[PDB]
Design an enzyme around this catalytic site. Structure first.
Site, PDB file in Angstrom:
ATOM      1  N   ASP A  25      -4.786   8.714  -5.515  1.00 44.96           N
ATOM      2  CA  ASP A  25      -4.663   7.292  -4.439  1.00 44.96           C
ATOM      3  C   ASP A  25      -5.839   6.710  -4.695  1.00 44.96           C
ATOM      4  O   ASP A  25      -6.995   7.228  -4.111  1.00 44.96           O
ATOM      5  CB  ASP A  25      -4.351   7.849  -3.165  1.00 44.96           C
ATOM      6  CG  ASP A  25      -4.008   6.474  -2.234  1.00 44.96           C
ATOM      7  OD1 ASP A  25      -4.061   5.409  -2.890  1.00 44.96           O
ATOM      8  OD2 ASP A  25      -3.681   6.972  -0.911  1.00 44.96           O
ATOM      9  N   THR A  26      -5.919   5.663  -5.461  1.00 47.63           N
ATOM     10  CA  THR A  26      -6.925   4.761  -5.538  1.00 47.63           C
ATOM     11  C   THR A  26      -7.601   3.895  -4.454  1.00 47.63           C
ATOM     12  O   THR A  26      -8.764   3.379  -4.284  1.00 47.63           O
ATOM     13  CB  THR A  26      -6.925   3.863  -6.683  1.00 47.63           C
ATOM     14  OG1 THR A  26      -5.777   3.066  -6.464  1.00 47.63           O
ATOM     15  CG2 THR A  26      -6.681   4.662  -7.926  1.00 47.63           C
ATOM     16  N   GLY A  27      -6.621   3.923  -3.290  1.00 48.22           N
ATOM     17  CA  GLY A  27      -6.895   3.224  -2.187  1.00 48.22           C
ATOM     18  C   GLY A  27      -7.466   4.123  -1.036  1.00 48.22           C
ATOM     19  O   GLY A  27      -7.533   3.655   0.103  1.00 48.22           O
TER      20      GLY A  27
HETATM   21  C1  LIG Z   1      -0.317   7.180   3.404  1.00 48.93           C
HETATM   22  C2  LIG Z   1      -0.505   6.831   1.770  1.00 48.93           C
HETATM   23  C3  LIG Z   1       0.382   8.029   0.882  1.00 48.93           C
HETATM   24  C4  LIG Z   1      -0.207   5.359   1.480  1.00 48.93           C
HETATM   25  N1  LIG Z   1      -0.839   4.349   1.784  1.00 48.93           N
HETATM   26  C5  LIG Z   1      -2.032   3.915   0.917  1.00 48.93           C
HETATM   27  C6  LIG Z   1      -3.560   4.449   0.760  1.00 48.93           C
HETATM   28  O1  LIG Z   1      -4.160   4.217  -0.426  1.00 48.93           O
HETATM   29  C7  LIG Z   1      -4.144   3.981   2.026  1.00 48.93           C
HETATM   30  C8  LIG Z   1      -4.549   2.250   1.760  1.00 48.93           C
HETATM   31  C9  LIG Z   1      -5.577   1.751   3.003  1.00 48.93           C
HETATM   32  C10 LIG Z   1      -6.682   1.523   2.600  1.00 48.93           C
HETATM   33  C11 LIG Z   1      -7.390   1.007   3.448  1.00 48.93           C
HETATM   34  C12 LIG Z   1      -7.090   1.056   5.113  1.00 48.93           C
HETATM   35  C13 LIG Z   1      -6.004   1.541   5.231  1.00 48.93           C
HETATM   36  C14 LIG Z   1      -5.141   1.815   4.238  1.00 48.93           C
HETATM   37  N2  LIG Z   1      -5.424   4.566   2.076  1.00 48.93           N
HETATM   38  C15 LIG Z   1      -5.656   5.364   3.039  1.00 48.93           C
HETATM   39  O2  LIG Z   1      -4.928   5.765   4.221  1.00 48.93           O
HETATM   40  O3  LIG Z   1      -6.987   6.080   3.244  1.00 48.93           O
HETATM   41  C16 LIG Z   1      -7.683   6.621   3.944  1.00 48.93           C
HETATM   42  C17 LIG Z   1      -8.228   8.203   3.745  1.00 48.93           C
HETATM   43  O4  LIG Z   1      -9.213   7.614   2.718  1.00 48.93           O
HETATM   44  C18 LIG Z   1      -9.784   6.535   3.468  1.00 48.93           C
HETATM   45  O5  LIG Z   1     -10.051   5.517   2.536  1.00 48.93           O
HETATM   46  C19 LIG Z   1      -9.630   4.178   3.684  1.00 48.93           C
HETATM   47  C20 LIG Z   1      -8.591   4.462   4.219  1.00 48.93           C
HETATM   48  C21 LIG Z   1      -8.782   5.876   4.611  1.00 48.93           C
HETATM   49  S1  LIG Z   1      -0.398   3.294   2.972  1.00 48.93           S
HETATM   50  O6  LIG Z   1      -1.373   2.433   3.467  1.00 48.93           O
HETATM   51  O7  LIG Z   1      -0.069   3.810   4.387  1.00 48.93           O
HETATM   52  C22 LIG Z   1       1.058   2.264   2.160  1.00 48.93           C
HETATM   53  C23 LIG Z   1       2.443   2.838   2.236  1.00 48.93           C
HETATM   54  C24 LIG Z   1       3.262   2.147   1.928  1.00 48.93           C
HETATM   55  C25 LIG Z   1       3.144   0.801   1.421  1.00 48.93           C
HETATM   56  N3  LIG Z   1       4.304  -0.044   0.795  1.00 48.93           N
HETATM   57  C26 LIG Z   1       1.966   0.277   1.439  1.00 48.93           C
HETATM   58  C27 LIG Z   1       1.095   1.150   1.919  1.00 48.93           C
END
Ligand SMILES: CC(C)CN(C[C@@H](O)[C@H](Cc1ccccc1)NC(=O)O[C@H]1CO[C@H]2OCC[C@H]21)S(=O)(=O)c1ccc(N)cc1
Lengths: 99, 99
Positions: A25-27
């Site tokens: 997960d790059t996000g």
């Molecule tokens: C739950 C994951 C499997 C999927 N997610 C994408 C993910 O990259 C999110 C994307 C993301 C990015 C920033 C803020 C919220 C969500 N990042 C995240 O939750 O990371 C958290 C743990 O590491 C920290 O980094 C930032 C948030 C923390 S998600 O945001 O909930 C998502 C799910 C489905 C869709 N269509 C769109 C987005």
């Protein structure tokens, strides 16, 4: 390995002797797993995402063997729908995005 | 381009004539953006993530110019902390994970 994104980028990993599948997960800034035990002293923290914030336990210098590479780093434990390999560990395997 | 993961993988996008920065998120199945106007109808839906679920508006056939590449697809609009480019559009620019 080159990985396309037509399906979820799930890899098999070995952490603390347990086999799991985690999302590259790059996000995700950080790596988070569902409930499990780990070595060392942990501090309770709170992470936030799309839907809100969850209470989790943070462990440092945890070993994960991911698809045949080895990485050590912070691994957070708490209620997540997926095991997620955040960027802290992706950097250590030299993972890049290409297009 | 090749993108390392030492810093968040943000890019500048042009959507509906608005310049935005969005995250190249391999963990996201779909694309979600902050509040904004868009063409066409939209069915209300709910997305789930770390920490729970949020209600959002779903638009189809939305055009985005990502780093000079054009893609069209489903874009979600709602209360996210980051604009997220998910797999539903990452596949269209031929984006891959490499290590
Ligand atoms: C739950 C994951 C499997 C999927 N997610 C994408 C993910 O990259 C999110 C994307 C993301 C990015 C920033 C803020 C919220 C969500 N990042 C995240 O939750 O990371 C958290 C743990 O590491 C920290 O980094 C930032 C948030 C923390 S998600 O945001 O909930 C998502 C799910 C489905 C869709 N269509 C769109 C987005």
């Amino acid at each position: 390995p080159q990985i396309t994104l037509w399906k979820r980028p799930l890899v098999t990993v070995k952490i603390e002797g347990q086999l799991k599948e985690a999302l590259l997960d790059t996000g995700a800034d950080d790596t988070i797993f569902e409930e499990m035990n780990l070595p060392g002293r942990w501090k309770p923290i709170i992470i936030g995402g799309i839907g809100g914030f969850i209470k989790v336990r943070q462990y440092d210098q945890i070993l994960i063997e991911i698809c045949g590479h080895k990485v050590i780093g912070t691994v957070v434990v708490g209620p997540t729908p997926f095991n997620v390999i955040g960027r802290n560990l992706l950097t250590q395997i030299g993972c890049t995005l290409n297009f």
